[PDB]
Design a protein around this ligand. Structure first.
Ligand SMILES: N#Cc1cc([N+](=O)[O-])ccc1Oc1ccc(F)cc1Oc1ccc([N+](=O)[O-])cc1C#N
Length: 467
């Protein structure tokens, strides 16, 4: 991804977008009770914690493109993964607006808390001013869509979230694109059935884990990945995606039976128009994290990518014995013979991708079930039911997250959520967690699940329904 053109908003007649200047994260009542090193990301330019230039850092992820056509490796990659998705019987038919906007099995209702984007955001108009979760009204939306169209600029927001000292210091805050409500809805219409199928079929056929529930899904993973594990990091995945990969994506959507017209939306993602604060810029390549389907699409591409590096480096490779699961840039994979991930990483670099050893590793080491992570979680078989596998989020991370809040009114929900995570570290660990929570008076006011109830409900969860 490369920033092609940049100018002042006033010159094209765009109003300044008034994004928030201060963080919503403050120290929680638990901030002194636990250790942690992370702090809210830098959102403004004058932040005294900065040890680099902010405007420069946030955009620097835009490292460049490699100009090329789809090669022989890409094609055969596309076909293999095409071969897989066909099994699923994805409907290329649009989805009925009601479903696309207000929910259905496999596609959550369009979130009414996020930005509506341009131009509504400029006009003080909020999502809730347009949609209602009570009347399922589409009369207003239809007016706005007809009024303002598709293909609108995107609004760029600095992601307000906890980060390490290194990234606060370097100003490497992450950017999120708010798509215009219309484009959101349109895309949901066009791809809703794809999304529905992806969320209902996490695993090695979709090669996706987007929408999954670790609690249930972890147990499936080792079953699906028989082989020697392959795992690894990207750096700036979304924004390094060159246009070539989008060509491949639309190439794959075409085999699923999407028309050229219907794939024009991939271009909307690839060559993008952004309204940042008082600037207005055009970007060629780069997945614009935050528009509709960016996770699914990031995964699908990744599915293409890895199969392409396998093919180019290991002539002889049989892909039908390959298995992968992506969540956007996060990949876990297996082959029956060892694979040198470093080879792949160097190969990938010729395509403008920065691959790295898994979990900020020193070298592309042996990947076991002991050290493998996915969505920041480890795997540990339950001591008692060995076919059951715990998703184990590290305590360090739970400790980090507990020390801040964006809204103390939700403490109960927040601490329960963290509870749902921590207990996989084991009873000793869980009881220390609970004691320290409880060493503050607010901690004593919270309804907190007992370990033994967490264990029971989990064991009980793999008793009903599918997967
Ligand atoms: N469309 C849409 C859409 C709407 C919102 N929103 O705020 O209402 C947010 C993300 C949206 O994109 C997706 C819509 C449906 C999907 F099945 C998947 C979408 O993309 C994601 C799916 C999953 C995740 N995730 O959980 O990380 C992030 C994204 C993103 N961006």
């Amino acid at each position: 991804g490369e920033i092609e053109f940049i100018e002042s908003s006033k010159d094209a007649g765009f109003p300044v977008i008034n994004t928030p200047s201060k963080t919503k994260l403050e120290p929680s009542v638990f901030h002194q009770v636990f250790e942690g090193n992370k702090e809210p990301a830098v959102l403004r330019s004058g932040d005294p914690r900065l040890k680099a230039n902010f405007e420069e850092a946030i955009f620097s992820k835009y490292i460049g493109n490699v100009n090329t056509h789809v090669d022989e490796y890409m094609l055969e990659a596309v076909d293999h993964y095409a071969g897989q998705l066909a099994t699923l019987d994805i409907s290329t038919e649009p989805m009925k607006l009601e479903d696309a906007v207000y929910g259905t099995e496999g596609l959550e209702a369009l979130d009414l808390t996020t930005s509506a984007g341009y131009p509504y955001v400029a006009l003080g108009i909020k999502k809730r001013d347009i949609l209602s979760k009570k009347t399922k009204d589409l009369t207003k939306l239809k007016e706005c869509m007809d009024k303002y169209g598709l293909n609108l600029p995107m609004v760029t927001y600095v992601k307000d979230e906890l980060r390490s000292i290194e990234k606060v210091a370097k100003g490497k805050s992450r950017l999120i694109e708010a798509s215009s409500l219309n484009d959101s809805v349109a895309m949901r219409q066009t791809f809703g059935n794809l999304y529905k199928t992806f969320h209902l079929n996490p695993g090695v056929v979709t090669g996706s884990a987007v929408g999954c529930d670790p609690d249930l899904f972890w147990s499936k993973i080792p079953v699906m990945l028989d082989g020697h594990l392959i795992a690894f990091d990207y750096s700036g995945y979304d924004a390094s995606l060159s246009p070539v990969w989008f060509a491949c994506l639309k190439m794959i959507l075409e085999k699923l039976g999407y028309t050229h017209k219907e794939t024009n939306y991939i271009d909307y993602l690839c060559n993008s128009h952004h309204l940042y604060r008082d600037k207005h810029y055009f970007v060629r390549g780069g997945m614009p994290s935050g528009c509709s389907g960016t996770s699914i699409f990031n995964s699908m591409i990744n599915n293409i990518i890895i199969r392409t590096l396998m093919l180019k480096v290991y002539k002889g490779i049989d892909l039908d014995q390959f298995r992968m699961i992506a969540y956007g840039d996060d990949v876990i994979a297996s082959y029956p013979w060892p694979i040198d991930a470093s080879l792949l990483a160097e190969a990938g670099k010729g395509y403008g991708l920065i691959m790295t050893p898994a979990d900020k590793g020193e070298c592309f080491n042996e990947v076991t079930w002991t050290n493998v992570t996915f969505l920041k979680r480890y795997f540990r078989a339950d001591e008692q039911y060995p076919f059951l596998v715990h998703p184990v989020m590290p305590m360090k991370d739970i400790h980090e997250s507990i020390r801040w809040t964006k809204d103390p009114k939700n403490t109960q929900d927040h601490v329960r959520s963290l509870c749902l995570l921590a207990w996989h570290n084991g009873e000793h660990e869980y009881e220390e967690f609970i004691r320290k929570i409880r060493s503050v008076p607010v901690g004593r006011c919270l309804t907190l699940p007992a370990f033994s109830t967490l264990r029971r409900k989990w064991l009980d969860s793999f008793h009903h329904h599918h997967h």
